[PDB]
Amino acid sequence: DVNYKMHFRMINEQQVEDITIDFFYRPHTITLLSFTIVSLMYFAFTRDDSVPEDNIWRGILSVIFFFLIISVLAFPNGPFTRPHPALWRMVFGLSVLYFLFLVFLLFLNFEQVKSLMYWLDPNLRYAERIISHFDIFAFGHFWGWAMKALLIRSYGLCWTISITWELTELFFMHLLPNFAECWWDQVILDILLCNGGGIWLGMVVCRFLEMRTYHWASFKDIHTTTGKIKRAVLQFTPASWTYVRWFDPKSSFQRVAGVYLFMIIWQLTELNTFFLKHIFVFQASHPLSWGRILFIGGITAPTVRQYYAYLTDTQCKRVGTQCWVFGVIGFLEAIVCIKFGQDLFSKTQILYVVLWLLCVAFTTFLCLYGMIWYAEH
Amino acid sequence: DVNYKMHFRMINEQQVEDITIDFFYRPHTITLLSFTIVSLMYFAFTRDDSVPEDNIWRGILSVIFFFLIISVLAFPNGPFTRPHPALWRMVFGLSVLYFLFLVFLLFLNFEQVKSLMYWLDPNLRYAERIISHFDIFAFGHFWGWAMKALLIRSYGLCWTISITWELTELFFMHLLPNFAECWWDQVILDILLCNGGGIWLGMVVCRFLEMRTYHWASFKDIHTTTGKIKRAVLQFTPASWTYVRWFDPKSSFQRVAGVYLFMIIWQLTELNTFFLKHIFVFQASHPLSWGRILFIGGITAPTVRQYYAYLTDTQCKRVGTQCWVFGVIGFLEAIVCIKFGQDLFSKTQILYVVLWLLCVAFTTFLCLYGMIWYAEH
Ligand SMILES: CCCCCCCC/C=C/CCCCCCCC(=O)O[C@H](COC(=O)CCCCCCCCCCCCCCC)COP(=O)([O-])OCC[N+](C)(C)C
Ligand SMILES: CCCCCCCC/C=C/CCCCCCCC(=O)O[C@H](COC(=O)CCCCCCCCCCCCCCC)COP(=O)([O-])OCC[N+](C)(C)C
Ligand SMILES: CCCCCCCC/C=C/CCCCCCCC(=O)O[C@H](COC(=O)CCCCCCCCCCCCCCC)COP(=O)([O-])OCC[N+](C)(C)C
Ligand SMILES: CCCCCC(=O)OC[C@H](COP(=O)(O)OC[C@H](N)C(=O)O)OC(=O)CCCCC
Ligand SMILES: CCCCCC(=O)OC[C@H](COP(=O)(O)OC[C@H](N)C(=O)O)OC(=O)CCCCC
Ligand SMILES: CCCCCC(=O)OC[C@H](COP(=O)(O)OC[C@H](N)C(=O)O)OC(=O)CCCCC
Ligand SMILES: CCCCCC(=O)OC[C@H](COP(=O)(O)OC[C@H](N)C(=O)O)OC(=O)CCCCC
Ligand SMILES: CCCCCCCCCCCCCC
Ligand SMILES: CCCCCCCCCCCCCC
Structure with missing residues (x-):
């Protein structure tokens, strides 16, 4: 109740701690109102509105x-x-x-x-x-x-998702068999080099950040110019890193189901990207492709953190709004791909679509044993 | 700081007090997530989208x-x-x-x-x-x-703005002189009966609600059927009525200028309604006309109480988000009328537009003395 609304506020609206330069956080909403009104007056009385499409x-x-x-x-x-x-x-x-x-x-x-x-x-x-x-x-x-x-x-999550999605991309070769490609392109170059290197780098950086102690000082108190620059640039880095262990040694069925849903939604987002690009046929270099990927990643970071917070913390009893919105976005992209994609589908074998659902379940079950047995040793 | 964010939360996000039926307030944002996805699935796979316009x-x-x-x-x-x-x-x-x-x-x-x-x-x-x-x-x-x-x-506000607008609505006869009307249409029918009668009824309701004690009991605890029905309908009535006094006996120049802006923006919304009807020709019976008035009426109720809270309480140091938006809406409708209304403007005398600005200032100055002198007596 009292803790519930506070615990959810830690997921939705995280507050800034240790505010030294109060200028950066003092609201000036009336100045914002004046700025918007003056900007609209300028763009309404000075702009040229003779062209409809540009308008x-x-x-x-x-x-x-x-x-x-x-x-x-x-x-x-x-x-x-x-x-x-x-x-x-x-x-x-x-x-x-x-x-x-x-x-x-x-x-x-x-x-x-x-x-x-x-x-x-x-x-x-x-x-x-x-x-x-x-x-x-x-x-x-x-x-x-x-x-x-x-x-x-x-x-055991990133590698499972990587292998499953790469095999699904390889299986979906029948949709676009015109392009000259081989299994080796989407096996070696992706699983071993691209995805593997990315996972390794991300893991080493996360390991660094977890054991790094955070000593954020006031920008004003720092004297040397190099110190001020270092403080400014280091601001874009995170101020703290939460301790993320998905699988408890005594994890209940609810936690396993939550992690399973997490993996399923991840594969759904990958599938949505693939099928959107396939159905609406824009090249990868087009802004509608890489802009969407960048936006989805920017959404994904806070969504991942909020989903972890909801899944683990037993005090949190409401899923954050950004995680909600990301779930709706993923499912709506899937529905769009389904509705507009019946032309390319001919003899859909969902037998493979069922297939990674068990293969993810088998792997997230080995993750438990691979840690439960390792916990004993 | 600690009080500031707490005090602004009392204007933006007012919390419910004495929650008895917790069902009505427990969030179910995952059920709301499943409802939308299932709702769109029905409207995407069963709906008929052959008509481009109705889609x-x-x-x-x-x-x-x-x-x-x-x-x-x-x-x-x-x-x-x-x-x-x-x-x-x-x-x-x-x-x-x-x-x-x-x-x-x-x-x-x-x-x-x-x-x-x-x-x-x-x-x-x-x-x-x-x-x-x-x-x-x-x-x-x-x-x-x-x-x-x-x-x-x-x-001294509801009558100043009733009197000065009805003369501004009447003065604008030159813009639309085609319609057959007399000055007594907007002198007796509106100033005395419609507006004057409305203010009287509105004031006797406040007199009742301010000295009425609020004894909201649990809906469950009530036993008789008539009591349960009475409790249900009485919910739509307000739970409390704040004692609002715009003019302090020792009001500062910031407070007088605060009320002066409230009086000015009130005319602007009245001025916006008159003009956009005149510019984009549609009658009052059209849902584009009375639909907007109903919406602005519902918007006004929380905006007035947020503006009053910001004006008076020295602890409140941020204007509420609803009062912010209504300020922008009331101004953007004025820019819209200006930009699209130059066709009807022929030899506009802004001299009358200046005129009520002083006439409101003179009346809001007599309101001070009319209360300051009455305070002594
Ligand atoms: C046609 C095709 C055929 C093949 C189909 C194949 C089908 C395969 C089968 C799939 C079936 C899988 C069923 C899994 C059910 C899990 C239930 C469970 O454990 O409950 C909860 C978790 O689950 C939740 O409810 C979490 C929140 C989810 C809602 C937000 C959505 C946003 C997603 C975006 C996610 C981020 C993605 C990021 C992407 C990078 C946990 O139980 P709880 O007690 O509620 O939790 C305790 C915590 N509190 C409450 C105490 C605080
Ligand atoms: C120049 C622009 C204006 C300038 C002035 C600015 C004022 C802005 C206005 C503000 C008032 C908002 C109401 C608008 C009037 C509706 C238009 C009208 O007369 O058509 C009726 C709609 O009857 C319905 O069935 C209504 C359905 C639900 C309501 C939807 C309305 C739009 C969103 C409002 C929700 C609230 C949102 C915010 C509220 C402010 C009848 O037409 P129909 O039977 O549908 O006939 C079919 C024909 N079409 C349309 C399909 C082709
Ligand atoms: C071309 C045409 C010619 C004719 C032109 C004529 C021109 C005429 C001339 C007009 C000039 C009038 C200028 C008066 C400025 C005084 C300001 C003042 O005293 O500050 C504040 C009030 O003022 C504010 O700032 C309040 C918030 C306003 C912003 C939101 C707008 C929403 C409106 C929605 C209105 C709703 C309407 C609903 C209607 C039913 C008070 O001072 P403060 O110290 O900030 O307050 C202390 C309190 N804290 C801060 C300690 C907590
Ligand atoms: C461009 C600015 C360069 C960097 C300038 C600089 O010194 O930034 C400091 C401020 C915050 O300063 P504090 O150290 O008090 O807050 C920190 C908080 N107490 C904590 O440690 O969590 O950064 C911003 O507000 C965002 C600025 C960027 C806005 C996009
Ligand atoms: C202009 C944008 C510059 C980029 C800004 C940037 O990187 O900062 C965003 C966050 C910062 O996290 P906090 O310090 O607020 O807390 C963190 C929280 N308490 C936790 O538990 O982790 O970092 C990430 O998500 C990094 C992942 C990649 C995000 C793209
Ligand atoms: C249709 C419902 C009929 C009326 C049914 C009824 O008994 O309502 C009670 C509930 C809340 O009951 P409380 O008295 O605990 O909350 C009140 C709080 N303690 C206070 O007094 O401030 O009202 C609503 O949510 C109304 C939602 C209506 C749907 C918009
Ligand atoms: C379905 C809608 C039914 C109508 C619902 C309704 O009338 O309730 C809205 C509010 C209720 O006010 P509260 O009880 O939340 O507190 C009040 C606050 N603490 C105060 O300071 O006043 O009343 C008005 O604004 C009445 C004005 C007319 C509003 C149209
Ligand atoms: C010439 C066309 C340029 C198009 C650029 C589109 C960029 C979209 C990126 C959105 C970023 C969102 C960050 C969370
Ligand atoms: C047949 C056309 C009907 C149009 C109805 C429009 C209703 C708009 C009212 C909005 C209510 C907002 C309450 C705050």
Whole structure:
């Protein structure tokens, strides 16, 4: 009750501790009101509004910007408080915008969605060997895996997800057999080098952060210029690292089911990315692909932390709002891919779709024994 | 600091006191997660999306519906906690929807706004004596004035703004001289009966509610059926009524200028209503006209109590988020009228627009002496 609302406030709206420069946190919401009104007056009395399409585009951009401002004013900032809670409020505002956009798309038919996508960018309408495969997107995949390893902190989770998803991508070759590819490309380059290296780097960084002691001093008290610069740059780094062990030695059935649902939703997000790219046929270099991946990772970090907090802490009896929104976003992307994807499906074998559900369950069951037996030894 | 955040929480997120039926307040945000996903699955796989135009309409309704659900989870509930804080989160969720809508319109040109309005309702494109003037809108205008009187509790405000607006509504006859009307339409029917009668009814309600003692008991503890029914209907009535006195006997210049801004923004909302009807031609009977007045009426109730809290209590050092949004909405509607209204502007004398600014200042200055001198006697 009294603790419940406080325990949930530690998941939704984490407060900033040890505020030295009070200027950075004192609200000035009336100044924000004046700024918004004056900006709208300028953009309404000086802008040129003779072109319809550009008017619609700029209106959409302005609506997004001022929804971000409203999110700063009202929305919660998750379990994170660096560099500033306003940033995570803005990320939550983007999450809500995306969730509503996905809600809208479920009512338009395929022709209307295609027309909207062509409106977003008209160019869509027209649309040894080891060394060559490395690219910027391999860099992105590796760094995303590193961030996931940082946030999850379990080899038996990240590796299970990596192997399962790589095998699913290999199995879904029949959807797009035109492209010239081999199993080795999506086995070695991904499981061994990209995903493996990302997981290793993330794990070593998490190990460092867990045993690092945090001695955040006031930016004002520091005297030397190099010290001030170091304090400024180190702010973007986390101020603390929670001790994340998913599997208790005496874990109950509820905890195992929670971790299983976590892994299932992770694979669902990977599947949503794959099938969105497949159905709406934009290249990986297109902003609608890598921008969405970046946004999903930025959502994923606080969502992972909130899901861990809800699953472990027995005092927390409400799931955080960002984790809720991420769950809705993942499931709505799955529904969108289902609804708009019946054209490419011919003789769907869900027998493989059932297959990793047991294979994840078998592996998350060996994770228990692999630790329960190791706990004895 | 510690009190500041606590005191602002009393304006933004008022908590429910003496919770007896805990069922009505226990969150079930995972059940709300399963409800939306299952709801969209039904509307995505069973609905017929062959009509391009009706898909956009139902999509807009769905986005609005699922922004209320997000607003229930995240947005604050103002200074009000009856009949349930969720309702006042949905009412806030409409304010953010409406405020962002006005941000969009400030970039569209007059042809697109008209084209958008005809889309909402295609019928817009084509578009003794005392007893006869009474109508349903006189009922609304009276009850709107009665509702305001509850939240203000001062004759020297509700009458100053009633008198000075009715003369400003009457002075604007030159803008629309086609309609056959006389000065006595807005002199006896409104100033004396509609507005004057509404204020009197509103004031006697406050006189009752302020000296009424509140003895809210458990709904379960009540035994008789008539008592249970009486308790249920009585929930929609307020649980408490704060003693509001705008003018302190020793009021400072910051307080007088605080009330002066309240009087000015009140006219602006009255001025916005008159103009956007005149600019975008639609009659009062249209749902685009009376629908907006009902929404602004519901928005006004928490905004007045948040503005009063900010004005008086020296501990409150942040204006509530609902009072912030209503300030932006009341101004964006004025910018919208200015940008799209230059066609009717021919030889505008802002001399009368300056005129009530002094006339309100003179009357809000006599309100001081009218109370300061009465305080001595
Ligand atoms: C057609 C296809 C065919 C194949 C289909 C295959 C189907 C396969 C089968 C799948 C079935 C799996 C069933 C698992 C049930 C778990 C129940 C359980 O343990 O309860 C709880 C956990 O579970 C929860 O409820 C947690 C919150 C979830 C809600 C937010 C969603 C956001 C997700 C985003 C997640 C993040 C993802 C990040 C991504 C990187 C724990 O019990 P509790 O007592 O509530 O917890 C105690 C804690 N308190 C309450 C005391 C504080
Ligand atoms: C230029 C723009 C305006 C400038 C002034 C600004 C004022 C802004 C306005 C504010 C008032 C909001 C009400 C708008 C009036 C509705 C339009 C109308 O007359 O059409 C009726 C809708 O009848 C219904 O069935 C209503 C369904 C639920 C309500 C949805 C309304 C939109 C969101 C409101 C929810 C609250 C959100 C915030 C509230 C502020 C009848 O039409 P229909 O039977 O649907 O006929 C089908 C034709 N189409 C439309 C499908 C093609
Ligand atoms: C071209 C046309 C020509 C004609 C133009 C005519 C121009 C006419 C000229 C107008 C000039 C009037 C200027 C007066 C400024 C005085 C300010 C003042 O005293 O500060 C504060 C009040 O003022 C505020 O700042 C309050 C919050 C306002 C922001 C939210 C707006 C929402 C409105 C929604 C209104 C709802 C309406 C509902 C209606 C039914 C008080 O001082 P403070 O020290 O901050 O307060 C102490 C308390 N704390 C801080 C210690 C806690
Ligand atoms: C660009 C700024 C450079 C860095 C300037 C700098 O010194 O930042 C310090 C401030 C916070 O200063 P404190 O050390 O009191 O808060 C810290 C808190 N008590 C804790 O340790 O948790 O950072 C921000 O607000 C965010 C700034 C960035 C806004 C995007
Ligand atoms: C401009 C943005 C710069 C990037 C800002 C940045 O990295 O800081 C975000 C958080 C900071 O975490 P806190 O210090 O608030 O607490 C942490 C919390 N108590 C915990 O338990 O971990 O770190 C991550 O999530 C790092 C993962 C990658 C995130 C992308
Ligand atoms: C339809 C319900 C009929 C009325 C049924 C009824 O008995 O309501 C009681 C509940 C709350 O009951 P309490 O007296 O414990 O809370 C009140 C608090 N202790 C106080 O006094 O402030 O009211 C609602 O949630 C109303 C939601 C209505 C749905 C919006
Ligand atoms: C379905 C909706 C039914 C209508 C519900 C209704 O009337 O309740 C809303 C509030 C109730 O106020 P509280 O009891 O939360 O506290 C009051 C606060 N502490 C104070 O200081 O006043 O009353 C008004 O604003 C009445 C004005 C008219 C509002 C339209
Ligand atoms: C949480 C962070 C969200 C970041 C969103 C990234 C989207 C960027 C899109 C850029 C498009 C550029 C086209 C030229
Ligand atoms: C705060 C309460 C908001 C209520 C909004 C009222 C809008 C109703 C519009 C109904 C249109 C009906 C057209 C047939």
